């Protein structure tokens, strides 16, 4: 424990439905009791699974291959509440509306190797943007800051 974004050791079971409604292979990521990310089995495009979690447990979803961030119920993070009368809680994993600059960045990353990012005819500014690959840790630093700032 101690980081702001971490799962609470509640010991209160919560039944969640993970539904992948994106064209990406989804990687569910669970933040453990010390706020460290843990990978879980992947969900192919269009697949849905009934999974077992607990109250106050933090989740985030990424592209399994590229590590691009995804939305769950139109937002970054997912925390399941209590099962009201044994009803399952639904986690709808969708694709965010990426910025055209970030979406262009993804497509060129999938076609070019990391060693050949400097070989392109693009400006100096875009080499650093292209080398800044998306990861769970940087988006956590941005989120821990955002909710601590709020």
């Amino acid at each position: 424990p101690r980081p702001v974004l971490r799962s609470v050791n509640s010991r209160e079971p919560s039944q969640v439905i993970f539904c992948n409604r994106s064209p990406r292979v989804v990687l569910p990521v669970w933040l453990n009791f010390d706020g460290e990310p843990q990978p879980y089995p992947t969900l192919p495009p269009g697949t849905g699974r009934r999974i077992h979690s607990y109250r106050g447990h933090l989740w985030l979803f990424r592209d399994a291959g590229t590590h691009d961030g995804l939305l769950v119920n139109q937002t970054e993070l997912f925390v399941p509440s209590l099962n009201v009368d044994g009803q399952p809680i639904f986690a709808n994993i969708t694709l965010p509306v990426y910025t055209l600059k970030e979406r262009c960045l993804q497509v060129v990353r999938s076609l070019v190797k990391p060693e050949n990012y400097r070989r392109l005819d693009i400006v100096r500014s875009l080499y650093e943007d292209l080398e800044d690959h998306p990861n769970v840790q940087k988006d956590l630093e941005r989120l821990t800051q955002e909710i601590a700032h709020q």
Binding site: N9, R11, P13, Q15, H52
Partner: protein, 115 residues
């Protein structure tokens, strides 16, 4: 020096091999997660709650070093493994659900092999 006869150690590991090698309709080996307990560094919350931790590696070691003197003593620890899994993971969990079927696979195997 050797407190258990050869036929007792033979039938003890015959029952545990049936529980370890058991597979459901899907073809998934239920025992997989129960073979190795996670370290205190990995899951410190497991040791805070469970007072007598046990896995299938320590159960096969306890058959090899002659700690259990009967089939009842072996069951004592296989049921403890399942109750620790149920107590820690709670109702609904796949680990909780896998523990219940592994308990019946041990009892039906003890009924089969012994008598």
């Amino acid at each position: 020096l050797s407190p258990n006869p050869p036929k007792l150690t033979k039938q003890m590991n015959a029952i545990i091999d049936t529980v370890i090698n058991y597979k459901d309709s899907s073809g998934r080996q239920l025992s997989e997660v129960f073979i190795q307990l996670p370290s205190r560094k990995e899951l410190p919350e497991y040791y805070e709650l469970i007072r007598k931790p046990v896995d299938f590696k320590k159960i096969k070691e306890r058959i090899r070093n002659h700690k259990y003197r009967s089939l009842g003593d072996l069951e004592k620890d296989v049921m403890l493994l399942c109750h620790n899994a149920q107590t820690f993971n709670l109702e609904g969990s796949q680990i909780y659900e896998d523990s219940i079927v592994l308990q019946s696979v041990f009892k039906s195997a003890r009924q089969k092999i012994a008598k």
